[PDB]
Amino acid sequence: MFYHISLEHEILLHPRYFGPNLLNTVKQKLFTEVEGTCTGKYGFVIAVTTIDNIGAGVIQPGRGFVLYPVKYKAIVFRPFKGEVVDAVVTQVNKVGLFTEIGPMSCFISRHSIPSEMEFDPNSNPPCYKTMDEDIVIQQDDEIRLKIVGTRVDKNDIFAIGSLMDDYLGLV
């Protein structure tokens, strides 16, 4: 789920960057350092909205590099277990379904899916229907799910969905 929290970070600036654009250079470096990354503490970060302030640059002894402990006001996306969101199905396979929760991709197996949704390998587009063929679920459809698990593959979140609770499909 997307959130707006206040984070902090420090970046060493090489002395060649000193000059009238010092603050601009620090901001530019901050933008291209904490956008799109991920961490196991705060989760996946989308982008930065604004910066609070620039700390006092403490020049290191015997080294020209100076660090600026900046505190930026950026957004973050850290999904938790039990949350329910609305994603879009990307691909349908007999092994399982694939979706895309924004910057993360989950996966639901046939076991999680009830027995009513069978396979349609004969038809060209992989899809799942029922005996009466009333409800139809395919790709590019806003289908909900439940985040029953979480995982971080070295700054690459990959949760797992489920389809056991009622009211999970076309709105």
Partner: protein
């Protein structure tokens, strides 16, 4: 132990600020509008594009005033912050569906008290 169903989160995340799909959508749209201008700038990455096309398919309302009103009419209640995003984003039809999806609502409030809120949310949709 971290399960949002039972309303438990780490200490750092407890003091977070919730965001709605439309809110993040307009924030990213404005960021894109600002970044596209001012030439000689590093263009957006695939992450921004995927997030944009992901939040654009769930924008229940484009008007910012709609977001303001739906957050104002909701914050007056006694629900936690976590209940402000999922319920405002999914927009269930009946109170039964909302109670089923979110187990926290089971026994927290009456039936009509939640049905009226859901009807108001549905009407607020464009």
């Amino acid at each position: 132990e971290e399960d949002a169903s039972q309303l438990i989160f780490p200490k750092e995340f407890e003091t977070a600020e919730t965001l709605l799909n439309s809110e993040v959508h307009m924030l990213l749209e404005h960021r894109k509008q600002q970044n596209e201008s001012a030439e000689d700038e590093q263009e957006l990455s695939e992450v921004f594009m995927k997030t944009l096309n992901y939040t654009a398919r769930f924008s229940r309302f484009k008007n910012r005033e709609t977001i303001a009103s739906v957050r104002s009419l909701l914050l007056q209640k006694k629900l936690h912050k976590f209940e402000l995003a999922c319920l405002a984003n999914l927009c269930p039809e009946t109170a039964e569906e909302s109670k089923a999806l979110i187990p926290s609502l089971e026994g927290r409030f009456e039936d009509e008290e939640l049905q009226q809120i859901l009807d108001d949310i549905q009407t607020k949709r464009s």
